[PDB]
Each structure stands twice: as structure tokens, then as C-alpha cells.
Design a protein around this ligand. Structure first.
Ligand SMILES: [Mg+2]
Length: 326
């Protein structure tokens, strides 16, 4: 399937990697920023998998090959890259650690892997772009185009020799974890978030939400995936601000291509309309981020720190709009 594969030096190096003692405590916190520790990113993921799922959950050799090959199949784009993948996986780790027994062993291992793989082989182009210009991917995947591709990429990596970390699961559990991963990755398509959140909010307010109901579990997991995928808005302001720079760098490049195809891009993707960014961020926080973390906190009380951090960043964008930026 034209997948990149890690080298022996790469996965063997990870196998011997040891995570500094000081970071063990930091990694448990919601606001942890992996940014200053690039060389340790693969190791941080191994650590989280081991703490959440156990050191024997996966054959170590296979897990290290899987991780280093996943890294190699993320592209050098400004935002939807390897750093983003590990950042999202860490948010999931923090959510799971704080709500551990609400999720099964199968779900925790599937969700950590889904987060690491949720944007696999992203090229820096949105579903809007692929569908507007009839990219082959849009023909193959009519909706949630890039997300269906990310899942396909995930399965392709598992299919590489010695990379299938899930093979030791019974045939029933194997099928189940692949479905958990497929649904989780598809849920990262923000187009689906709006309806999912509205539904969950109503089930919560009316008291019909039932975690013993599979469809309800699927929706809760979907909201968790959205929360993790957007977690840059829950970091300390300087981190959130720096990440916004990368997000827009990617958007502006897409907008440049649209102009070449004769189409005016939306203002958010127009590098000649940067003055509109602060209000654009306000709109995103009000329509997507705040409601997401608000409903997540209602369903999973321990995730409240994400909501508090999101609210703090909304306030920061409001300060920018008032001309108080430093
Ligand atoms: Mg995505």
C-alpha cells in the first residue's frame, strides 16, 4: 500500500529508550505540553500505553515497529503532523487515566492507538478541498474523506510484517478493536461533531444517556476524540498561540492552491486576511471548543480541567480583539 516503514535502528532505539523520572509525574496532567521534548515523543507514547494498558498488553518489538512506522507515515506539514499525533494521544491518556474503569481494556488500547493514527498521511488539505476539486480520495470516500483515509492507513500499517500489535487478541476482540478504532478516527471529522454533541447534550440533560448502551458509548468516545483532537486549545496560552500559527500556516497554503484554481478561499484560509483571525478564533471557540468541553465535563466530571483551560484561552482571544495583546 506504499507505506513507509521504520528502520531496525529506529524501532530498536525506541525499545531501549528510558523516560526521565521528572516527566513521569508531568505526563499525568491535562495541560502537559510535549513540545520541549521532541526526541522523547515515541517513548512518551510507549510509556502511556504501558501505564494505561500494561507492559505486556503488546509485544514490545511489534509496538515499537508500529510506533516508528506510524511516525514515518505522517508528513512534514505545518500542523497535522507527528507532533500533533502524540499531543492528541497524550490528551486521551489523561482522559483515560482520570476515568479508567469506565472504559474496557480493549477500548483503552484501541483509543490510544486511534489517537496516534487519527491524521495518518494527512497532506495539509481539508475535506472541503478534496471534494471541491474531485480528488480521487473524494470518489473513494464520499464523506469524512480524509478520516476514512486515515483509518485505511492505520490498517495498512498493521499489515506490515511484524507490525500487527493486535494479532494476539481473540478473533472476536480483534474485530471489535478495529471497529473501535474506525469509529474513533471517523469521529475526528468535525462535520460529525456538531450532531454528536447536540445528541449527547440532550441524552445527558434528559437522563437517557446510558454507557451500557453501545450506541451511547460510541457517541461518548466520539466526543472524547473531538476533545483530544482539538486539545491545543486547552494548553497554556503561549502554547495554544504558537500552535495556532501552525494551524493557519497549513490553512493559508490550501487557500493559495484554491486561488490558483480560480476560487476565492474562505477568509480563514486567505493569508491576505490575517486581520480576521482573532474573530475567527472567537467563532471557533464559541461554536466548537467550548460546547465540546462543556458537554464532555458533564459526562466525565474529571475532564473539567480541559474546559477551564479552554475558557481561559477564549478570554485570551477576547483580549487580542480588545487590542491588549503582548
Ligand atoms: Mg483529522
Amino acid at each position: 500500500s506504499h507505506m513507509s516503514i521504520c528502520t531496525s535502528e529506529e524501532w530498536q532505539g525506541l525499545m531501549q529508550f528510558t523516560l526521565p523520572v521528572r516527566l513521569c509525574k508531568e505526563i499525568e496532567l491535562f495541560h502537559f505540553d510535549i513540545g520541549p521534548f521532541e526526541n522523547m515523543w515515541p517513548g512518551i507514547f510507549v510509556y502511556m500505553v504501558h501505564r494505561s494498558c500494561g507492559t505486556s498488553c503488546f509485544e514490545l518489538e511489534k509496538l515499537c515497529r508500529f510506533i516508528m512506522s506510524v511516525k514515518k507515515n505522517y508528513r512534514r506539514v505545518p500542523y497535522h503532523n507527528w507532533k500533533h499525533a502524540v499531543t492528541v494521544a497524550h490528551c486521551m491518556y489523561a482522559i483515560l487515566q482520570n476515568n479508567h474503569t469506565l472504559f474496557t481494556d480493549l477500548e483503552r488500547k484501541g483509543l490510544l492507538i486511534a489517537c496516534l493514527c487519527h491524521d495518518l498521511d494527512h497532506r495539509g488539505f481539508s475535506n472541503s478541498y478534496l471534494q471541491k476539486f474531485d480528488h480521487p480520495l473524494a470518489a473513494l470516500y464520499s464523506t469524512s474523506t480524509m478520516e476514512q483515509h486515515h483509518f485505511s492507513q492505520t490498517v495498512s500499517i498493521l499489515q506490515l510484517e511484524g507490525h500487527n500489535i493486535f494479532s494476539t487478541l481473540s478473533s472476536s476482540e480483534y474485530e471489535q478493536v478495529l471497529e473501535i478504532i474506525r469509529k474513533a478516527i471517523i469521529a475526528t471529522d468535525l462535520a460529525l461533531y456538531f450532531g454528536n454533541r447536540k445528541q449527547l447534550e440532550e441524552m445527558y440533560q434528559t437522563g437517557s444517556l446510558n454507557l451500557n448502551n453501545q450506541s451511547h458509548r460510541d457517541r461518548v468516545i466520539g466526543l472524547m476524540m473531538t476533545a483530544c483532537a482539538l486539545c491545543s486549545v486547552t494548553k497554556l496560552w503561549p502554547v495554544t498561540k504558537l500552535t495556532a500559527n501552525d494551524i493557519y500556516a497549513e490553512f493559508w497554503a490550501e487557500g493559495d492552491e484554491m486561488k490558483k484554481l480560480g476560487i476565492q478561499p474562505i477568509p480563514m484560509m486567505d493569508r491576505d486576511k490575517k486581520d480576521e483571525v482573532p474573530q475567527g478564533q472567537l467563532g471557533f471557540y464559541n461554536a466548537v471548543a467550548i460546547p465540546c468541553y462543556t458537554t464532555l465535563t458533564q459526562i466525565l466530571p474529571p475532564t473539567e480541567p480541559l474546559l477551564k483551560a479552554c475558557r481561559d484561552n477564549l478570554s485570551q482571544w477576547e483580549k487580542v480583539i480588545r487590542g491588549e495583546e503582548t
